[PDB]
């Protein structure tokens, strides 16, 4: 009964609150997408746009929560780019060992960081891993996590090495399936990194609208923003 353009009207305030809180580039993308929904000619068109807003907004709030830089998908570095720029002396061997699985070079995680020496810098990778493991162990939130390890090598105290942190996030109903499929996708890379002597950590996590608001991977303040905007929108597009 309600037209979609009209649905976007009633949600003007919640979406203004949403756009005001996201990072700039993230806000703009969501703003363009919202106008796409308002001007949607089809229901499939408006649903697809909303799905995108859901993922892009959530990742902007994930960045804010973690004091990480939000990186638009178009600007996200690939695994090959990180190896070439963080581990240049191993890039040739990386290419050779990816001849059978060249798709690995193009893997693009949501976040691709390295320890502070287009890959972002993080002061401590282990600190990020620990807070993921803490919330998983405290709130029962599903994660998967893997660290490359050559043979049975021990960590060492007399020398520092460069390392990568690869993070996948998401806002979708099937959280377990998200983290199980992510770690499986990256398992071959981790084993590759192990053979190259490159230290990497992969983390994957997910939230859905049934998660208790105090238990998400984003600040509860950001949860209310998503629930009041995008999640309500999905209800309106179905019921109308």
């Amino acid at each position, epitope marked *: 009964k309600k037209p979609i353009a009209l649905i976007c009207a009633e949600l003007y305030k919640p979406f203004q609150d949403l756009f005001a809180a996201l990072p700039k580039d993230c806000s703009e993308e969501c703003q363009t997408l919202f106008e796409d929904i308002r001007n949607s000619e089809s229901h499939a068109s408006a649903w697809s746009s909303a799905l995108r807003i859901k993922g892009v907004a959530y990742e902007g709030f994930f960045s804010l929560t973690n004091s990480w830089r939000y990186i638009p998908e178009d600007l996200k570095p690939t695994l090959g780019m990180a190896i070439q720029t963080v581990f240049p002396d191993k890039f040739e061997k990386f290419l050779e060992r990816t001849h059978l699985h060249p798709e690995y070079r193009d893997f693009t995680p949501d976040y691709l960081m390295c320890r502070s020496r287009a890959v972002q810098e993080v002061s401590s990778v*282990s600190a990020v891993v620990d807070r993921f493991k803490s919330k998983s162990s405290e709130k029962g939130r599903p994660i998967r996590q893997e660290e490359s390890r050559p043979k*049975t090598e021990s960590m060492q105290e007399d020398i520092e090495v460069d390392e990568l942190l690869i993070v996948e996030v998401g806002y979708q109903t099937d959280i377990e399936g998200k983290v199980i499929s992510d770690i499986e996708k990256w398992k071959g890379v981790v084993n590759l990194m192990s053979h190259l002597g490159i230290k990497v950590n992969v983390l994957t996590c997910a939230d859905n609208s049934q998660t208790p608001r105090t238990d998400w991977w984003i600040d509860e303040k950001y949860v209310r923003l998503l629930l009041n905007s995008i999640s309500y929108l999905f209800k309106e597009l179905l019921e109308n």
Partner: antibody
């Protein structure tokens, strides 16, 4: 001077439990990994466990996995070994050790003797 | 586990002569960080062990310079250029490249008489 001083050794019945301590002095304990090594009488050296400076990384010899726990208290400059389900084969002198900058055993305590017998 | 094979098991040597102790690793001890974590210890009778050499060839501070180490990969050697009476005891190699850290079985240095 760097000194490591173990305590807590003694006599335990098989299946029993014992907690060892190691008091470290003469260096900034909280910045370094700490280790336990043991030696059964007349036998060679066997590494037991390793704990990183901030306790994030812990390794165990396969013969103590599931039975021993290594831990530390950095404000009190103390390293611990909690031993459980002890067996006669665990009878040994227990040394704490550190590399003071590496995973090698550069400094050793005088050791503490643990006898597991009924 | 890494297996460290020491040879000989016992080494009789006259005071003032050189001694050489071999340590062979079942796999390479070269770590992906570029270091090789093979180390040498002396345990004098009734005492705790003492570090002599760390990462193949670095003499530990204060260790007398008659001790030196060499090698690479899986093959390492501890040399005492001129044996003294105080060098009596058991020499161990050990490795901390891989978990578990492991020791050789020990080489007993015996003063010849």
């Amino acid at each position: 001077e760097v000194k490591l001083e173990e305590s807590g050794g003694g006599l335990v019945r098989p299946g029993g439990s014992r907690k060892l301590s190691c008091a470290a002095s003469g260096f900034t304990f909280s910045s370094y990994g700490m280790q336990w090594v043991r030696q059964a009488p007349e036998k060679g050296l066997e590494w037991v466990a390793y704990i990183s400076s901030g306790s994030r990384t812990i390794y165990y010899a396969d013969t103590v996995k599931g039975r021993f726990t290594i831990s530390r208290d950095n404000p009190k400059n103390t390293l611990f070994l909690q031993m459980t389900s002890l067996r006669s084969e665990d009878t040994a002198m227990y040394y704490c050790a550190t590399g003071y900058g590496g995973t090698w055993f550069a400094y050793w305590g005088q050791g503490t003797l643990v006898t597991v017998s009924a | 586990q890494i297996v460290l094979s020491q040879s000989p098991l016992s080494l009789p040597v006259s005071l003032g002569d050189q001694a050489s102790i071999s340590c062979r690793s079942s796999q390479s001890l070269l770590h992906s960080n570029g270091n090789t974590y093979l180390h040498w210890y002396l345990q004098k009778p009734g005492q705790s062990p003492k570090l002599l050499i760390y990462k193949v060839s670095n003499r530990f501070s204060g260790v007398p310079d008659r001790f030196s180490g060499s090698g690479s990969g899986t093959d390492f050697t501890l040399k005492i250029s001129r044996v003294e009476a105080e060098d009596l005891g058991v020499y161990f190699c050990s490795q901390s490249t891989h978990v578990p850290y492991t020791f050789g079985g020990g080489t007993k240095l015996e003063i010849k008489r």
